[PDB]
Design an enzyme around this catalytic site. Sequence first.
Site, PDB file in Angstrom:
ATOM      1  N   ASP A 181     -12.401   4.415  -5.423  1.00 37.20           N
ATOM      2  CA  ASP A 181     -11.349   3.461  -5.078  1.00 37.20           C
ATOM      3  C   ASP A 181     -10.440   3.161  -6.268  1.00 37.20           C
ATOM      4  O   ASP A 181      -9.259   2.877  -6.092  1.00 37.20           O
ATOM      5  CB  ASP A 181     -11.997   2.164  -4.575  1.00 37.20           C
ATOM      6  CG  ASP A 181     -11.044   1.282  -3.770  1.00 37.20           C
ATOM      7  OD1 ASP A 181     -10.033   1.766  -3.216  1.00 37.20           O
ATOM      8  OD2 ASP A 181     -11.336   0.066  -3.689  1.00 37.20           O
ATOM      9  N   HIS A 186      -1.646   0.685  -0.813  1.00 37.63           N
ATOM     10  CA  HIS A 186      -2.791   0.836   0.091  1.00 37.63           C
ATOM     11  C   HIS A 186      -2.401   1.646   1.323  1.00 37.63           C
ATOM     12  O   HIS A 186      -2.382   1.136   2.444  1.00 37.63           O
ATOM     13  CB  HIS A 186      -3.383  -0.525   0.470  1.00 37.63           C
ATOM     14  CG  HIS A 186      -4.116  -1.198  -0.649  1.00 37.63           C
ATOM     15  ND1 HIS A 186      -3.612  -2.295  -1.314  1.00 37.63           N
ATOM     16  CD2 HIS A 186      -5.309  -0.923  -1.229  1.00 37.63           C
ATOM     17  CE1 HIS A 186      -4.464  -2.673  -2.250  1.00 37.63           C
ATOM     18  NE2 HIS A 186      -5.500  -1.853  -2.224  1.00 37.63           N
ATOM     19  N   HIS A 216     -11.486   3.908   4.344  1.00 46.57           N
ATOM     20  CA  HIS A 216     -11.884   2.644   3.713  1.00 46.57           C
ATOM     21  C   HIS A 216     -10.819   1.542   3.592  1.00 46.57           C
ATOM     22  O   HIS A 216     -11.154   0.400   3.271  1.00 46.57           O
ATOM     23  CB  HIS A 216     -12.458   2.915   2.331  1.00 46.57           C
ATOM     24  CG  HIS A 216     -11.415   3.039   1.271  1.00 46.57           C
ATOM     25  ND1 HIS A 216     -10.636   4.167   1.121  1.00 46.57           N
ATOM     26  CD2 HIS A 216     -11.012   2.171   0.314  1.00 46.57           C
ATOM     27  CE1 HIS A 216      -9.807   3.991   0.108  1.00 46.57           C
ATOM     28  NE2 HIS A 216     -10.013   2.788  -0.395  1.00 46.57           N
ATOM     29  N   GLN A 219      -3.431  -5.132 -17.240  1.00 47.38           N
ATOM     30  CA  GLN A 219      -4.055  -3.830 -17.023  1.00 47.38           C
ATOM     31  C   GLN A 219      -5.123  -3.534 -18.074  1.00 47.38           C
ATOM     32  O   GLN A 219      -6.157  -2.948 -17.756  1.00 47.38           O
ATOM     33  CB  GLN A 219      -3.009  -2.712 -16.966  1.00 47.38           C
ATOM     34  CG  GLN A 219      -2.243  -2.644 -15.653  1.00 47.38           C
ATOM     35  CD  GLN A 219      -3.120  -2.245 -14.479  1.00 47.38           C
ATOM     36  OE1 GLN A 219      -3.467  -1.072 -14.314  1.00 47.38           O
ATOM     37  NE2 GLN A 219      -3.480  -3.220 -13.651  1.00 47.38           N
TER      38      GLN A 219
END
Length: 322
Positions: free
Chosen positions: A227, A78, A116, A279
């Site tokens: 995102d 991030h 964001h 995943q």
Amino acid sequence: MSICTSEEWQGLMQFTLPVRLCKEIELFHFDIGPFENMWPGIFVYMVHRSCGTSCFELEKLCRFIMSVKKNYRRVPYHNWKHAVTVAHCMYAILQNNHTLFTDLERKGLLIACLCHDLDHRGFSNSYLQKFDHPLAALYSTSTMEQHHFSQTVSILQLEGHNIFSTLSSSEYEQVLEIIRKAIIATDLALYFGNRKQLEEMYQTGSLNLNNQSHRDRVIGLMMTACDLCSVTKLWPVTKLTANDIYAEFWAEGDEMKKLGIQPIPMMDRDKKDEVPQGQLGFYNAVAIPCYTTLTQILPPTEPLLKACRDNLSQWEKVIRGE
Ligand SMILES: COc1cc(OC)c2nnc3c(C)nc(-c4ccccc4Cl)n3c2c1
Ligand SMILES: [Mg+2]
Ligand SMILES: [Zn+2]
């Protein structure tokens, strides 16, 4: 709150993009990876090509971008690279759907995308809500995203940083609201309800882009898609990104242990074996349906779906030993 230096933003002002990149930056599959130094400049280019060279006071835009950079933390996933990656995806969606969106929305969403995840620590909302911690007190729900927006506004309130100042008071509040809703939407908690509504609306034939509430939902799903977009890159890039993502999940698991709690497999570094299966579950339940619905609503976004499909197939291969 961290501020950029004179040398940084003026250096960014001086920057020109290489010719070859101009064609490539237009494509969905574009990977910013090999061009770290050019990231601040890639955003400027994207803003100039989508909104216009005179859309923002160049000095202010550069001060803004470089200061935004400095309030992203040196964390595995991030971070500043993620911020630019997400913004580029938005650019790709906007360019391919340009007239569906007003000038204000395009300006807002590109800035929202870049901002964001501002000041992200690598910890989930679930974590902060269980171990209060002031951020969950201030923002009871949705929690880091509320914090990211607060950070965006704080940057805009720095001297010579307010790129939206020349807008009318009406347009100024509108763009802030576009940005607030967009950032909040990147709370994945909210995605699941959102996609279901949009699926319903598209299936039934109810979807109406002139309907603000419908519109806000569509922008929301665009935010999720951007995102998540590291799942739409080439396999070797996608693979490496997943490693950065789990590096973060495991640190949070460590803390849950380091302060006496037993974390879910996902955040347990002693459970790396289960990752490929995790995943696959994420693609099947989150990513695939997201790009499917987005493709249904905005047809030019189809290559995001196909790239996601290709990566799913790569996870299936891992699982079955190939
Ligand atoms: C529970 O959150 C997950 C689980 C995943 O794999 C099982 C995830 N796998 N891949 C992700 C990507 C590319 N981006 C995210 C993400 C999106 C919104 C907020 C935080 C993140 Cl890390 N995730 C995951 C998020
Ligand atoms: Mg986020
Ligand atoms: Zn993000």
